[PDB]
Amino acid sequence: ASRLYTLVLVLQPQRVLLGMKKRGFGAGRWNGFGGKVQEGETIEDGARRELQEESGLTVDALHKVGQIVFEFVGEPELMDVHVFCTDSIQGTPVESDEMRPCWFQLDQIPFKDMWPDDSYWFPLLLQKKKFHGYFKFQGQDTILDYTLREVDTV
Ligand SMILES: Nc1nc2c([nH]c(=O)n2[C@H]2C[C@H](O)[C@@H](COP(=O)(O)OP(=O)(O)OP(=O)(O)O)O2)c(=O)[nH]1
Prior knowledge:
Binding site for 8-oxo-ATP: 25, 33-36, 50, 54, 115-118
Strand content: 35-45%
Structural class: mainly beta
Domain Nudix hydrolase: 1-130
Bound molecules: 8-OXO-2'-deoxyguanosine-5'-triphosphate
Binding site for N(6)-methyl-AMP: 6, 21, 115-118
PDB class: hydrolase
Number of helices: 2
GO molecular function, one term: 8-oxo-7,8-dihydroguanosine triphosphate pyrophosphatase activity
Largest sheet: 8 strands, mixed
Shape: globular
Number of strands: 10
CATH superfamily: Nucleoside Triphosphate Pyrophosphohydrolase
Distance between the termini: 20 Å
Order of helices and strands: EEEHEEEEEHEE
C-alpha cells in the first residue's frame, strides 16, 4: 500500500535550487519541488507539473535519479517518492505563500534544516549516481532504519 509522490532537484554544475516549504508536510525544511501524482497523469508529467506549481520553473527533459520509499511508524500509507534531476530550466524561481526558493553552492547544502534522510542520498545525487532507498521514520526527525543502494536503472 503506497502513494506516489515526485521530487525534482534543479542541479547545475556548481549549485542546486532548494525551496523552504512554508506549509503542509515538511514545512520548515529545505527541499526539492514535488508533490502527489494525480489520476491520469504519468509520474514524469506530475514531476514537471509540480516543479512549475512550486517554483515557477519550466523543465523539458527530466532525468530519473532515484526511488525512495518512506515509512512513518503507525501510518498505514507508505510514500513512494520518485526523484528526478534537471540541469536545464526556463524562468526564474518564484517565492510564493507555499515556498521560498534559494540557490545553494554544492558544498553549502543545508542538511541540518532538511529531512534527515537527505544526508544519505543527496551526496549520491551530487555525484550523478542513481539509487533505491527505504527509510523508516519515527515522527519526522528520527530515522529508525534504512536501506540505500546504488542502481543502474531507477
Ligand atoms: N527530500 C525529501 N523530500 C521528501 C521527504 N519526504 C517527503 O514526503 N518528501 C517530499 C516528496 C514530495 O515532494 C513532498 C510531499 O508531498 P506534498 O505532501 O507536499 O504533496 P502535495 O503538495 O501534492 O499535497 P497537498 O498538501 O497540496 O495536498 O515532500 C524526505 O524525507 N526528504
